Write a protein that binds this ligand. Structure first.
Ligand SMILES: [K+]
Ligand SMILES: [K+]
Ligand SMILES: [K+]
Ligand SMILES: [K+]
Ligand SMILES: [K+]
Ligand SMILES: [K+]
Ligand SMILES: [K+]
Ligand SMILES: [K+]
Ligand SMILES: [K+]
Ligand SMILES: [K+]
Ligand SMILES: [K+]
Ligand SMILES: [K+]
Ligand SMILES: [Mg+2]
Ligand SMILES: [Mg+2]
Length: 1330
RNA sequence: GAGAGUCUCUCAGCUGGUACAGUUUUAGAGCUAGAAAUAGCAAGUUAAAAUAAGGCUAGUCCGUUAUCAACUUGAAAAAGUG
DNA sequence: CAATACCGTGTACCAGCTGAGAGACTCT
DNA sequence: CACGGTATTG
């Protein structure tokens, strides 16, 4: 028996079908195991496996790292307490015990309830003196008196526990950067460089203007207004803007050709500045560094809002300023509300449920919600002007612990810590001896290139130790091998050379690698002149001269430079034609020029004797990121360079790795020639062979040595699937598809199919907001100031396009109107009739698509000439990608050629994604295993890959319409159709095997691939007809009988029995919801620690059931404890699972059950299937809830009527009228549809209230247009859909979900265990238990 | 058809180092009039601790990804069964 | 046992490696 | 998000 398999691989479904030679789906009797009446069952060989989406590893990672975070912060606190141990025991022998048990209720505390001092008087006195921890911090920093050791510990521990970020390197002092003085020094430098045009900065209060709580451009405008005759876009204005963090363009200032866009926040700035300094000289360096100092001062003034000369604790002083202004403004507001609005005082200051001050301090209202609740109250009253100013400033009634404290560097807390230590070490010797230890506890963080400090039990760790002892912050450098660990951090992730699998790949910025790339590109260049008969290669001498003259003096080498600076200067050619390179050479010797600028010794770089050294240098600069370690490694070359050069080298860092090893490039040599690959690239006679030719040339030993260098352990199926590149969800689909195919082959008597057809489906507002913000601030536009928008709003396609286009038409140089977006047009850059791309990367917002030009191509040349500069501005602002820009500008490059259109249609039909090829390879290597007499693979099974458009057009052309919302059958159906089309297609044109089977003029191919599917049609327009029977031309075998086979497909799509199977899965992941709920009298609360009784301490609820368990046992009853037989579902929770599996009997007996029938324990994962009466089916949602378990097999006529009537997705107007006439002639179908649903709901769904409401809603809108009634009947199928119940809407009526909140009935129903395909079953009558 | 290097991007996956909030219990003596229910008023900004229960391998480590119908033999990994 | 309604930890930064989609140059 | 847990009302 011959058959083929159709597969439909999705992210939540794998559809499968089996077809015969006639495109029929077989049906078998399958054995049914179990204890029921039924010994066998009839099954069609079509169905679909359904599963929950596979999840990535990200969330797990973030939780794991948060875990390490909390562990290490606790360890810091433990280090500090161990330092304070003895002297604190001398002063108060229970302080740390009181701190530890602070969380406990006084009933469970072992010591006094007042943490700090242990008696109420002292505690109240403390809090009255220091209402916030910042008061105590400022006191301990500024005062000179001896202080209580407990208060010292509290300050230092608060600093260590919340120590602040590490985004700034080096040290930082409070008065290191004062805005006034740095602005004055910037004015000094500017007037030193520009004596003829000086600025009068007298009377300009730079402090308040730059350190104001305002946007960057607003403070810029403020300071520029204070300087008459100076504009914000002049030189000084741009310097201030760069200080304020904007993106100034110094081009117009210095009359530059290169766009000198400088933004200090960028990683490129260090280069972007130097590049600029290359054009205007080094006299301007002092200026551009004074501006950077000013920027640092402004950044600090953001955080420290107090004078740094009255205290050494500017941060704590600013927190105390927050507290004092909170107190004053709260007193004023209370008085104001007492006087003017005395009825609202209670709602404002007593009601936690409201977003007033009560909800702000005691409830759950945030600063933002509080400001929103209290702004109208302030505007409504009199005397609230300053309060409203502070509110719009986001500085009213501030707390100290807020969301925006993430700005605080750790250097600040460190300064305060160091100050306290210097104060109190005069009174405590142990603080003098352990000052640096405590400072280190604060400053030290495990380096990212070292990872978890494990000892052989972490699967994530790679760190290597210099000595075997406990790692502490004070011996890290001596116990951890920072060098070996930093090296392993990279060498455990970097590729080896595929040609030499034992050799490491070179750094991308290595000098040798760039030499290789340049020579490889340069070897295939060809040139022609007049007297020359034929185009020539460049000789070895010519290539060397072009490298020395051009590539070693210019960063980039254009074609024009090649023509004028070599062929004219050396060869005396006035005209020459070049091939093998266009506009400019892609390769270049960037590292050569970097090192030439740093060391300034060209003869050192050109000397081959230094090659090794240079490589090592670059290696280091690439392998490491810590400048101290780079310095340590380069120390062995300190004698070759000045100290200025060695510092400049330290700062020079590279990222990236190539794809070939040094041994391949310039190591292995050809036996006879004695030359390396690079030696051939430099000079290879008149052949000029490049890398591919070199390693593929049988006359050379490179190919032989590459063959010899190869090595093998083989992955398993699952391991091999896991190591593919792709979403983990699609990978889950791949593995399930393989398992389905294995079962299907086992079904067909271990006979392998003829062909297997596979189709794979295709593949955030915060990201959109970030893109638009960055693009507009880089563009310098004020559209956001004038049109504020939230991230959610950007989910509208037109508004997102409007903003990405700076509010302007993309085809016309004119502004657009937000309030008119509904009148505008979204147009595809390349037409969707060629490239089916609807992404933002191919779409464009324009006033009218007519203005694009002709609709049969790319935007016309006139539009390109008009809009090229605007498009390049959008490109540099990253508001359009380079791909979008190239497509937009293609008309100046000839536009769309006929070859491009042919390729686009081919892409529409021929699958080229790599993940699909990997699926095909897996199935192929699984099925075809034998080799013939020539030791070539015997391809018994042909694996065909199709794209969804083929079967989609098939459905839309032969009226095999699909409606996804009706049921899950469409997946299965898709599979079937694929298997059909696929097979038929390759039977009709066997030459297509090349492009459609795994394994090894433009108008003509356009026409061909556009008409490839016409052999199914009977008549074709653009109007010759076709036979009723389509056969293969050469073999004469029949492939499609247009009078019998369509009937076959219709009968297959009409079959009501389709094996839909929802994959039962144990639940995993978090134990429960994460919210810590307050204490409550409820056994649903779960203790967050072993002794934290939730009735006193609160805790969690809502745990996830890993899997239910059927228990047949006895439970005690009443006060007598009489044993009563029971049969029920106990939900084992994820957190209980290990304990329940280690010993199920003891777990159950501790849960209450006695005399447990151990062998009648049935493990029920989620989606376990139960059948009750009248074919009614339920799936296990949990231990106490059920999901719908039946599919509604709506007949095909109603499906197609719903598709056509609702205008689901056209064709000829005559065919459109015929479809409309069929819809209107079959209007009664509507009622019939309802009837079917009704008969289903009364039989399987059992939601009387919902069904009656839906029937009334349908009988209410019977005067609505047929299209809308059908569109809402589509909604109605949520009532019958398999799975969890959900709420839907019929027109404007809303039907809430009827839930199945009890699982008692399934305990007497028939449990059904299904194989992956649902063909094999085991049925268990549960009524026979108990 | 199957690929390779380079260039210009774009998306994705995987790992590590940190920070700020949030929440929970306790501590920040509420006062007065009332026997009480309650009413009037004062006050509020902070800290400690926990942040998957926990585990043994005891590390400044690990604990939410992937994988899983049923049945026999299996100790388990497996393999086999219509 | 009803319907029935409400609720669900979030944000930010820094460092790195890999594949792959798509346009272009050169090739097996 | 959905869809399972939870309390409320009855
Ligand atoms: K006690
Ligand atoms: K001015
Ligand atoms: K709050
Ligand atoms: K807080
Ligand atoms: K080029
Ligand atoms: K590096
Ligand atoms: K030196
Ligand atoms: K899972
Ligand atoms: K390539
Ligand atoms: K209290
Ligand atoms: K599992
Ligand atoms: K199953
Ligand atoms: Mg812990
Ligand atoms: Mg906190």
């Amino acid at each position: 028996k011959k058959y083929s398999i159709g597969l439909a691989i999705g992210t939540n479904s794998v559809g499968w079908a089996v077809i015969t030679d006639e495109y029929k789906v077989p049906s078998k009797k399958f054995k049914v195991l179990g204890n029921t009446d039924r010994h066998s069952i009839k099954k069609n060989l079509i169905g679909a496996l359904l599963f929950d989406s596979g999840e990535t590893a990200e969330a797990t990672r973030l939780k794991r790292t948060a875990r390490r975070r909390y562990t290490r912060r606790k360890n810091r606190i433990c280090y500090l307490q161990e330092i304070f141990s003895n002297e604190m025991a001398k002063v108060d022998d229970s302080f740390f015990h009181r701190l530890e048990e602070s969380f406990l209720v006084e009933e469970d505390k072992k010591h006094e309830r007042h943490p700090i001092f242990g008696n109420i008087v002292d505690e109240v006195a403390y809090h009255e003196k220091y209402p916030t921890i910042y008061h105590l911090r400022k006191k301990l920093v500024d005062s000179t008196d001896k202080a209580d050791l407990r208060l010292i510990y509290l300050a230092l521990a608060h600093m260590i526990k919340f120590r602040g970020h590490f985004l700034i390197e080096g040290d930082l002092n409070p008065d290191n950067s004062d805005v006034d003085k740095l602005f004055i020094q910037l004015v000094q430098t500017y007037n030193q460089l520009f004596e003829e045009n000086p600025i009068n900065a007298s009377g300009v209060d730079a402090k308040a203007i730059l350190s104001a709580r305002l946007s960057k451009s607003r403070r810029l405008e403020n300071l520029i207004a204070q300087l008459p005759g100076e504009k914000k876009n002049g030189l000084f204005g741009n310097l201030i803007a760069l200080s304020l963090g904007l993106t100034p363009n110094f081009k117009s200032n210095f009359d530059l050709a290169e766009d000198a866009k400088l933004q200090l926040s960028k990683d490129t700035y260090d280069d972007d500045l130097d590049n600029l300094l290359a054009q205007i000289g080094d006299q301007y360096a002092d200026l551009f560094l004074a501006a950077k100092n000013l920027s640092d001062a402004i950044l600090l003034s953001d955080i420290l809002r107090v004078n740094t000369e009255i205290t050494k604790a500017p941060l704590s002083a600013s927190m105390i300023k927050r507290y004092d202004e909170h107190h004053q403004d709260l007193t004023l507001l209370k008085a104001l509300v007492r006087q003017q609005l005395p009825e609202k005082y209670k709602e404002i200051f007593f009601d936690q449920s409201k977003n007033g001050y009560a909800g702000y301090i005691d409830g759950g209202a945030s600063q933002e919600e509080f400001y929103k609740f209290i702004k109208p109250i302030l505007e409504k009253m009199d005397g609230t002007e300053e309060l409203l100013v502070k509110l719009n400033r986001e500085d009213l009634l501030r707390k100290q612990r807020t969301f925006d404290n993430g700005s605080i560097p750790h250097q600040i807390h460190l300064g305060e810590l160091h100050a306290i230590l210097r104060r109190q070490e005069d009174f405590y010797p142990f603080l003098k001896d352990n000052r640096e230890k405590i400072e280190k506890i604060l400053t030290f963080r495990i380096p990212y290139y070292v990872g978890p400090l494990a000892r052989g039990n972490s699967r994530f760790a790679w760190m290597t130790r210099k000595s075997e002892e406990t790692i502490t912050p004070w011996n890290f450098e001596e116990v951890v091998d920072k060098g070996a660990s930093a090296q392993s951090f990279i060498e455990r992730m970097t590729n080896f050379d595929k040609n030499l699998p034992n050799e490491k790949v070179l750094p991308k910025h290595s000098l040798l690698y760039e030499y290789f790339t340049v020579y490889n590109e340069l070897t295939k260049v060809k040139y022609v002149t007049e007297g020359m008969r034929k185009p020539a290669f460049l000789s070895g001498e010519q290539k060397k001269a072009i490298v020395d003259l051009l590539f070693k003096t210019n960063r980039k080498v254009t074609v024009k430079q090649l023509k004028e600076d070599y062929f004219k200067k050396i060869e005396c050619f006035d005209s020459v034609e070049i091939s093998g390179v266009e506009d400019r050479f892609n390769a270049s010797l960037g590292t050569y020029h970097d090192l030439l600028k740093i060391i300034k010794d060209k003869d050192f770089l050109d000397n081959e004797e230094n090659e090794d050294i240079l490589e090592d240098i670059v290696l280091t600069l690439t392998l490491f990121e810590d400048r101290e370690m780079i310095e340590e490694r380069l120390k062995t070359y300190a004698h070759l360079f000045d100290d200025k050069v060695m510092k400049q080298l330290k700062r020079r860092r590279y990222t990236g790795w190539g794809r070939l090893s040094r041994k391949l490039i310039n190591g292995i040599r050809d036996k006879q020639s004695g030359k390396t690959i690079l030696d051939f690239l430099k000079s290879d006679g008149f052949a000029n062979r490049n890398f591919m030719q070199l390693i593929h040339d049988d006359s050379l030993t490179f190919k032989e040595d590459i063959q010899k260098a190869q090595v093998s352990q083989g992955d398993s199926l699952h391991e091999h699937i896991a190591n593919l590149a792709g979403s983990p969800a699609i990978k889950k689909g791949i593995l399930q598809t393989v398992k389905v195919v294995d079962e299907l082959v086992k079904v067909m008597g271990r006979h392998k199919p003829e062909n297997i057809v596979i189709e794979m489906a295709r593949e955030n507002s915060r990201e959109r907001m970030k893109r638009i913000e960055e693009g507009i601030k880089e563009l310098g536009s004020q559209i956001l100031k004038e049109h504020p928008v939230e991230n959610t709003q950007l989910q509208n396609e037109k508004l997102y396009l409007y903003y990405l286009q700076n509010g302007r038409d993309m085809y016309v140089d004119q502004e657009l109107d937000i309030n008119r977006l509904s009148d505008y047009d979204v147009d595809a850059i390349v037409p969707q009739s060629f490239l089916k791309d609807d992404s933002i990367d191919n779409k464009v917002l324009t006033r009218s698509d007519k203005n694009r030009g002709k609709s049969d191509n790319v935007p016309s040349e006139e539009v390109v000439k008009k809009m090229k500069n605007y498009w390049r501005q959008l490109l540099n602002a990253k508001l359009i990608t380079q791909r979008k820009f190239d497509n937009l500008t293609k008309a100046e490059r000839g536009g769309l050629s006929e070859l491009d259109k042919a390729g686009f249609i081919k892409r529409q039909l021929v699958e080229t994604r790599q993940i699909t090829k990997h699926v095909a390879q897996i199935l192929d290597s699984r099925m075809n295993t034998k080799y013939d007499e020539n030791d070539k693979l015997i391809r018994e099974v042909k694996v065909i890959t199709l794209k969804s458009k083929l079967v989609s057009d098939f459905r839309k052309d032969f009226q095999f319409y699909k409606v996804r919302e009706i049921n899950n059958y469409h997946h299965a159906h898709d599979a079937y159709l694929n298997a059909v089309v696929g097979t038929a297609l390759i039977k009709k044109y066997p030459k297509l095997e090349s492009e459609f089977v795994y394994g090894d003029k433009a108008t003509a191919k356009y026409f061909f691939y556009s008409n490839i599917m016409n052999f199914f049609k009977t008549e074709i327009t653009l109007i010759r007809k076709r036979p009723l029977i389509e056969t293969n031309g050469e073999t004469g075998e029949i492939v499609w009988d247009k009078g019998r086979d369509f009937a076959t497909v219709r009968k297959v799509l009409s079959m009501p029995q389709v094996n839909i199977v929802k994959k039962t899965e144990v639940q995993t992941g978090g134990f429960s919801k994460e919210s810590i709920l307050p204490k409550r009298n409820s056994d649903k609360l779960i203790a967050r620690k072993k002794d934290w009784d939730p009735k006193k301490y609160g805790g969690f609820d809502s745990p996830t059931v890993a899997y239910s368990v059927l228990v047949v046992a006895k439970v005690e009853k009443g006060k007598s404890k009489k044993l009563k037989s029971v049969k029920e579902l106990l939900g084992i929770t994820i957190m209980e699972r290990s304990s329940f599996e280690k010993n199920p009997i003891d777990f159950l007996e501790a849960k209450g059950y006695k005399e447990v029938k151990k062998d009648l324990i049935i493990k029920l994962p989620k989606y376990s299937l139960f059948e009750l009466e009248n074919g009614r089916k339920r799936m296990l949602a949990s231990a106490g809830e059920l999901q719908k378990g039946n599919e509604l097999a709506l007949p095909s006529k109603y499906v197609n009527f719903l598709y056509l009537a609702s205008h689901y997705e056209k064709g000829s107007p005559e065919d459109n009228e015929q479809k409309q006439l069929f819809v209107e002639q079959h209007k009664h179908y509507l009622d019939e549809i309802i009837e079917q649903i009704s008969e289903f709901s009364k039989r399987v769904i059992l939601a009387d209230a919902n069904l009656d409401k839906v029937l009334s809603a349908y009988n209410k809108h019977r005067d609505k247009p047929i299209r809308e009634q059908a569109e809402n009947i589509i909604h109605l199928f949520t009532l019958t859909n398999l799975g969890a119940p959900a709420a839907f809407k019929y027109f404007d009526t809303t039907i809430d979900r009827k839930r199945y909140t009890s699982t008692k009935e399934v305990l007497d129903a028939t449990l059904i265990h299904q194989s992956i395909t649902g063909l094999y079953e085991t049925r268990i009558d549960l009524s026979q238990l108990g």
